[PDB]
Amino acid sequence: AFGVEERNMVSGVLTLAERSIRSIMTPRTDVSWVNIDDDAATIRQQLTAAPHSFFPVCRGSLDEVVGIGRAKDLVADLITEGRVRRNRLRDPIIVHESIGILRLMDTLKRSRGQLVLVADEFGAIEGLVTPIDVFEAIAGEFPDEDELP
Amino acid sequence: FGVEERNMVSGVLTLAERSIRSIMTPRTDVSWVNIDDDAATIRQQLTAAPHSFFPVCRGSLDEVVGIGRAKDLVADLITEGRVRRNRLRDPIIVHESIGILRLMDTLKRSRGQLVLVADEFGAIEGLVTPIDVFEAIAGEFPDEDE
Amino acid sequence: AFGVEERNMVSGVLTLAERSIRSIMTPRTDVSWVNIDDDAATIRQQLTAAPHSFFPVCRGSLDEVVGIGRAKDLVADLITEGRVRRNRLRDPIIVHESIGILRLMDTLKRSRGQLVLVADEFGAIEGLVTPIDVFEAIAGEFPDEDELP
Amino acid sequence: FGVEERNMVSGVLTLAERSIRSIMTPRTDVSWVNIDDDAATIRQQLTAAPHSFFPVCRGSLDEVVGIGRAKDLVADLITEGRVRRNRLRDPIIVHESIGILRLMDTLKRSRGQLVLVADEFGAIEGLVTPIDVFEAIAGEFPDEDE
Amino acid sequence: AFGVEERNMVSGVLTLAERSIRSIMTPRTDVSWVNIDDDAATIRQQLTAAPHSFFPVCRGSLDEVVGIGRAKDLVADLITEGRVRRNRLRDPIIVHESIGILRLMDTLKRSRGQLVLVADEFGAIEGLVTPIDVFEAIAGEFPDEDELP
Amino acid sequence: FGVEERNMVSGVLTLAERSIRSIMTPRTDVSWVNIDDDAATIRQQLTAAPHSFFPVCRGSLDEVVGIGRAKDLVADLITEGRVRRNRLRDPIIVHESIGILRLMDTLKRSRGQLVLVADEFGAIEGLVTPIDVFEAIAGEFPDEDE
Amino acid sequence: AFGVEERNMVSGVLTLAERSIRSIMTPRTDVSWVNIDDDAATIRQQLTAAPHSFFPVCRGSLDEVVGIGRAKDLVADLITEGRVRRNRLRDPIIVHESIGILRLMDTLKRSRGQLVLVADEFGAIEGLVTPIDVFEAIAGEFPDEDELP
Amino acid sequence: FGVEERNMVSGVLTLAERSIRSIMTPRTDVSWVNIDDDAATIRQQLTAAPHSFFPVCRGSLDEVVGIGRAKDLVADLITEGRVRRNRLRDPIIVHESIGILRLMDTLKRSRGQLVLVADEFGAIEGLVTPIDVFEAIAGEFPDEDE
């Protein structure tokens, strides 16, 4: 009744509680984030080149997060107003890496499509996670358009 | 405790038995862009919906021209006053009968783009993304507007 | 002799004196304004994307109004000189929101096509108004190209 | 007082009786761009006139190619040395006999663009914007050069 | 043997010594100058939009002249190096407006195709002049591509 | 003194008697761009010469394709690796027999662009700008390399 | 058995030890270098316009070298992130001009395709060299795409 | 000492006797871009290899479409999602039998671009750059990955 795919997924589920958030998250070095101080042309190019829809919007560096922006809203602001509208950003959802995957899933269920940032106590961004990252731990890779197929 | 794992295992072991119809976003809930709408109408639709990809169609849902990314559509609508057809992505379309395991292989190859479910005559029955499959294993991940 | 359209317009006229400027003006959040400190490419994009012909030109923020610019003149300056020519701007016409619509109409008649800014005593811009905004209070919506039809 | 309201009400109640001819900017006062003029001539014309939209024509007013926004025309003239035809807006044109109430519906749909008034043979009789109708109700809103 | 054209030119010659440099020069407000602090895209656009070949290159404002640049050299620098190369600029030739046209002609003969700046004792640029400006005083207008024909 | 004026008046009164041949830059001194040269060669030629406008030709001077502005040619050569033909200006060409007064009217209409002097078979005899005429009245304004 | 080409190359080899690094290097004035403080559009244009693959990446001026960048990596960073990623740069290899060509060849053999900078004791960049520069001293010119053929 | 010079002189005096085959990068070691690969695959290939120029081919090495510069290919892959054919450089191709001296003349004219070595039927045998010739005189200049 069941085959290799199911067995692998069941194994995945039974190891979630042992794996770290660090092991599944998109790491700091691969975070795509918008520097609100960049010029409109630069940001616009970045938004179209990335496969992602939500972006931390920050002032000068990744750790200086002002909010989370939706690409489709950001592009509109940048074209018509020449800058990101700060008051249109969503509040970040942020967790510590130590909470583990089961607790993180509860948070992701409440995040309504928004990425979750992983940060230390001093506010340093360690990475970010979405439901896809957890699902991959169960069912295997769903690579982005700019990742190996 | 241990319940979350038990429930997820149960979910996995019933995947091959459930239909695509039972997990997909149904036709009635599809957000799609009518390329013949005026630009202000489409712009409003795009910001109001929570989704990032939209079928882009001429006049009705079944008349699919391509799949558009909202962030690209928005820029075109503002700078060109219309959706640029030649910027749209090719649709990925499956028949509902292929089952969830086969659909998962397709979704892995879709690289983030929604997959349309259509009959042999081209009628769109719904659409599906990896989240829809994940929900069958792990419970609901409600959209912003749900 | 008269029908629904006339009755509605007459009702509109007979309620002008009761309605506030706030209720008819384009509000602060929707003001399209040019930041004289932005680069030429950014401003040029903003001017072509907006349906409007006149723009407050400001230094760094909306409240820091230097003058009112005509898009067709601004585009020329930006292309040929790389910047807005400050000395070519028109002096702003500015009223307090409390003056009411009848008095505002007198001002609009004298403004010769230029938008009127609505500001508080401390110089904070609350909005802007043109004859179209008053006419809409009488005759119904005349939506811009980027507003719902 | 109360006079402003009385006068505006009187204006409203005589709208359906007045002709489009009586409120429009007449042919003799139309500012239009001759696409065959040299760039410096058109640039000067555009800055000197108070208007934002111009019929763009080949050789004479009746030979309308499209409607141009001054801010767009200016950029083309400087960067390309000529008016780009394919950037012009489609003209909106009515017959003078349709009356002011019907014209108002057209103006609401024109989204800021002037409406041309022309006869059946294409002769341009004048043009009209919402301001021209508003003046019939509320009195004059003189242009910069009036 | 001679007609209206000759008579007009002879009149022009016989009034040169009475006319001021101010009356023939391109005035300050119409000087096209490059701000070395502008970004490459802005300057490049300015150079192609202008009909002129030589440009004062200045730091922040017209009066802060660093040298005179040749458009064809400037464009090359801007594309390949992203900035104007200061050491490639030519030294400015500068006169006071009071020297009169006959003396200015001697200077123009020595300027080898380069525009001459007209400045006051405090270094404020009042305008610029080339042989065309003097010739126009004799023979009538030779308008630029962006001037009325 | 008074000599400068006397000499300039004498110059004016002999203009209608002098030939275009006698004031033009002769064929042998024409700087022209061979569109078939490699980009580095043309770039070097453009910086080395003092002139701003160049006939752009295919293989030989008489095979004129258009007139190019150095600042435009340079950008094309760097970004495209070649001269873009469709960016060139239309040549203005006169016969040497028209005389200086008529040539002056042409130069006034050329808006800064050099005028070519050619025979009926298309052979380029030289070129002329307002400076060449001015020199006939006022004495030499030597180029950087003269 | 041997002809003019061989004789010339042999002469070249027998004079290497007498020639200076200064005589073969690309001099300071012709170094193509990336200013990490420039905007993405400017740098991108510079990278495509130059025939070179490796570039010193510097902060504000050539002497302030942060590392050596590979064009293909830089372009990717600039498009997707809007800036050069400093941590992806290679460490510079730097020699003093006095070491002579034979010693420099040993260094070039170890540089694995990366250009070698020539600098004084105070860190002023005098030029840069690759194996092509040495080979030209033996076998004659191999001009770049933007150099005379 | 004096040995480096002696060895280099020996190298020079055996150039005309050595084959192109003996100095070229052989077919098996050619890095080439398959234009039909997906963008992420090509992007990874380009960053991983130490080389700057790549033959760009359709399906197999012999099906050469053009030569691409990595920095240009990368930009196209990110902005367009594919290699733009019309941006590629024309290949320079020689037969292995022409010998090293003649090849050096070709390399001097190639302006930095690799030269392909192919047979009369179009089979690519290898490729060569000035470094390959220099190594025959002066010893190895190993690539980053060698």
Ligand SMILES: Nc1ncnc2c1ncn2[C@@H]1O[C@H](COP(=O)(O)OP(=O)(O)O)[C@@H](O)[C@H]1O
């Ligand atoms: N701004 C971002 N920067 C880096 N990675 C991101 C970003 N947003 C999403 N991701 C990653 O993209 C992958 C797919 O996640 P998904 O929820 O489908 O987002 P999206 O479709 O917006 O990329 C996940 O690995 C996720 O961690």
Ligand SMILES: Nc1ncnc2c1ncn2[C@@H]1O[C@H](COP(=O)(O)OP(=O)(O)O)[C@@H](O)[C@H]1O
């Ligand atoms: N255009 C669309 N119309 C209707 N539902 C959609 C659309 N795009 C995605 N969905 C649904 O939204 C839910 C979340 O899917 P996800 O892949 O996160 O897409 P998104 O973030 O773009 O909404 C899924 O149930 C999916 O089927």
Ligand SMILES: Nc1ncnc2c1ncn2[C@@H]1O[C@H](COP(=O)(O)OP(=O)(O)O)[C@@H](O)[C@H]1O
């Ligand atoms: N710079 C501006 N920013 C925001 N709204 C504006 C601006 N200029 C005009 N408007 C609004 O545009 C609408 C139409 O006004 P109108 O006088 O026709 O100006 P325009 O044609 O220049 O847009 C009115 O609601 C007016 O308040």
Ligand SMILES: Nc1ncnc2c1ncn2[C@@H]1O[C@H](COP(=O)(O)OP(=O)(O)O)[C@@H](O)[C@H]1O
């Ligand atoms: N191109 C034009 N030629 C002549 N009159 C015009 C033109 N455009 C507008 N008008 C007139 O200018 C007056 C103000 O109209 P409005 O809609 O404010 O346009 P604008 O601000 O562009 O002049 C109206 O009487 C209108 O008919």
Ligand SMILES: Nc1ncnc2c1ncn2[C@@H]1O[C@H](COP(=O)(O)OP(=O)(O)O)[C@@H](O)[C@H]1O
């Ligand atoms: N940088 C400049 N800014 C403004 N006017 C200029 C400039 N350079 C030349 N001119 C003006 O252009 C006109 C033609 O002069 P000319 O010597 O032919 O220069 P060019 O061909 O470079 O424009 C003259 O009126 C001259 O004063």
Ligand SMILES: Nc1ncnc2c1ncn2[C@@H]1O[C@H](COP(=O)(O)OP(=O)(O)O)[C@@H](O)[C@H]1O
């Ligand atoms: N392409 C060219 N080849 C040869 N002579 C030229 C060329 N362009 C201009 N000249 C000559 O240069 C002199 C100065 O003319 P001018 O109009 O100032 O041009 P420019 O500043 O571009 O050299 C004149 O004698 C003119 O005939």
Ligand SMILES: Nc1ncnc2c1ncn2[C@@H]1O[C@H](COP(=O)(O)OP(=O)(O)O)[C@@H](O)[C@H]1O
């Ligand atoms: N960034 C650079 N700036 C200036 N010259 C360079 C640079 N990189 C290489 N060169 C020069 O280019 C020529 C060819 O060297 P080569 O090793 O083939 O590098 P590339 O192919 O990257 O240009 C040599 O003269 C070398 O000194």
Ligand SMILES: Nc1ncnc2c1ncn2[C@@H]1O[C@H](COP(=O)(O)OP(=O)(O)O)[C@@H](O)[C@H]1O
């Ligand atoms: N696309 C390629 N595939 C395989 N080898 C290459 C390629 N390009 C260059 N080479 C080899 O790399 C070595 C260094 O050559 P060089 O001209 O410095 O090129 P690069 O710096 O681009 O690798 C030479 O042996 C040359 O044959």
Ligand SMILES: [Mg+2]
């Ligand atoms: Mg990513």
Ligand SMILES: [Mg+2]
């Ligand atoms: Mg989602």
Ligand SMILES: [Mg+2]
């Ligand atoms: Mg993962």
Ligand SMILES: [Mg+2]
């Ligand atoms: Mg991934």
Ligand SMILES: [Mg+2]
């Ligand atoms: Mg939905």
Ligand SMILES: [Mg+2]
């Ligand atoms: Mg996704």
Ligand SMILES: [Mg+2]
């Ligand atoms: Mg849902």
Ligand SMILES: [Mg+2]
């Ligand atoms: Mg608006």
